[PDB]
Design a protein around this ligand. Structure first.
Ligand SMILES: C[S@@+](CC[C@H](N)C(=O)[O-])C[C@H]1O[C@@H](n2cnc3c(N)ncnc32)[C@H](O)[C@@H]1O
Ligand SMILES: Nc1nc2c(ncn2[C@@H]2O[C@H](CO)[C@@H](O)[C@H]2O)c(=O)[nH]1
Length: 371
């Protein structure tokens, strides 16, 4: 895709309306959200969707109930807003306690147990006594375990729709919700001769330890540019996460802007910067959406998102490369790290004209210079 195509919001039809989608936004042609949309029925007056994506799963409630939506992805909020669907930039556990009659939760299984658990408790807390929860997911991705936990948290739960491995259950709040679990974790790491303490919420990439790929990029970077080759330079970190690249580069004296689509990750980076006596801009952004048209940089780094066992480069990751080329000043440099067999080489050749391979072992570090 072009950058314009990556950022474009496109309305798709459904009976009675339309819904905007875009590359990089969750919840479109997803069997879990699809099964929800076929299942959810109004109950009471006030509903909360704790994982809406583009908003298909709880869309049947719109216009029949007041529906609030809490969403962590910037890309997904751009879509919801375009669709005229009330939505807040919010973590699931930021939900108002006891203020809803119905909650909708597509299980965010890909973000892991801690994130799901926090979401389950947020759902239980959000509901008034006697409120109900639609819980949807995948038996191949923990549905039975999470449904068992939901039933323990709330009361009577039963599966109300089945399609292959995909399930929707309906549950009733019959008991008092517990307090939220402890959410913050911290760990320390030594990077390029300096100590960092990272802080993060649940669901972030590489919780609890620095990704070896990120370490490899930083090693390649320092070898190429020298210990001082970053001081006073403007750096963009595409997909900054809790700051594995961001913090060291700030420590090295760079003026760093991190862009990150996930709110939990943005807040994690902010806490880490504070904890380490470091300054950087930690932007909640779908790729470079948050930047001015004019912003350019001297150095751009990225450890892009990837599909678990995938052989194809994600749309977001392709956009990262296109954006890096576009956002670099002449003489600027780009560093990217990935699995050795992802086909980034042709992309860098097309966008920069040439590239170099600085490292290839467990991961590869590719490099390009803006001409
Ligand atoms: C492989 S992780 C790398 C995180 C961090 N830079 C590190 O090295 O540990 C990729 C990051 O890209 C972020 N991401 C995914 N889609 C994005 C998007 N559309 N815009 C910006 N960041 C995105 C993810 O949330 C994740 O934090
Ligand atoms: N950072 C990064 N890690 C990867 C990639 N492909 C596989 N992995 C991880 O490397 C190892 C496993 O933990 C995989 O999840 C990639 O493209 N980038």
């Amino acid at each position: 895709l072009t950058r314009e195509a990556y950022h474009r919001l496109t309305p798709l039809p459904h009976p009675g309306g339309r819904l905007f989608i875009k590359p990089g936004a969750r919840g479109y042609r997803d069997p879990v959200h699809d099964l929800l949309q076929k299942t959810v029925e109004p109950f009471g007056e006030r509903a909360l969707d704790l994982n809406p994506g583009v908003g298909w799963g709880s869309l049947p409630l719109e216009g029949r109930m007041a529906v609030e939506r809490l969403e962590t992805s910037r890309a997904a909020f751009r879509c919801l807003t375009a669709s005229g669907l009330q939505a807040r930039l919010a973590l699931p556990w930021e939900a108002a306690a006891g203020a809803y009659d119905l909650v909708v939760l597509a299980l965010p299984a890909g973000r892991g147990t801690a994130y799901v658990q926090a979401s389950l408790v947020a759902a239980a807390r959000a509901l008034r006594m006697g409120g109900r929860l639609y819980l949807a997911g995948d038996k191949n991705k923990g549905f039975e375990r999470y449904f068992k936990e939901a039933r323990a948290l709330l009361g009577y739960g039963v599966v109300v729709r089945r399609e292959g491995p995909y399930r929707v259950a309906l549950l009733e709040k019959e008991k008092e919700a517990p307090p939220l679990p402890s959410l913050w974790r911290a760990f320390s790491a030594r990077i390029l001769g300096a100590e960092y303490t990272f802080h993060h919420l649940p669901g972030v990439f590489s919780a609890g330890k620095v990704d070896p790929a990120s370490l490899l990029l930083l090693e390649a970077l320092q070898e190429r540019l020298g210990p001082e080759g970053v001081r006073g330079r403007q750096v963009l970190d595409l997909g900054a996460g809790y700051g594995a690249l961001t913090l060291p580069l700030a420590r090295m004296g760079a003026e760093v802007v991190g862009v990150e689509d996930d709110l939990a990750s943005v807040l994690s980076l902010q806490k880490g910067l504070e904890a380490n006596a470091l300054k950087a801009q930690a932007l909640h952004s779908d790729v470079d959406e948050a930047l001015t048209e004019e912003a350019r940089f001297d150095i751009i780094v990225t450890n892009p998102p990837f599909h678990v066992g995938g052989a194809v480069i994600l749309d977001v990751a392709q956009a990262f490369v296109n954006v890096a080329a576009a956002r670099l000043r002449p003489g600027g440099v780009f560093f990217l790290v990935s699995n050795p067999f992802l086909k980034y080489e042709p992309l860098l050749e097309e966008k920069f004209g040439a590239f170099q391979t600085l490292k290839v072992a467990e991961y590869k570090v590719l490099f390009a210079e803006k001409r």
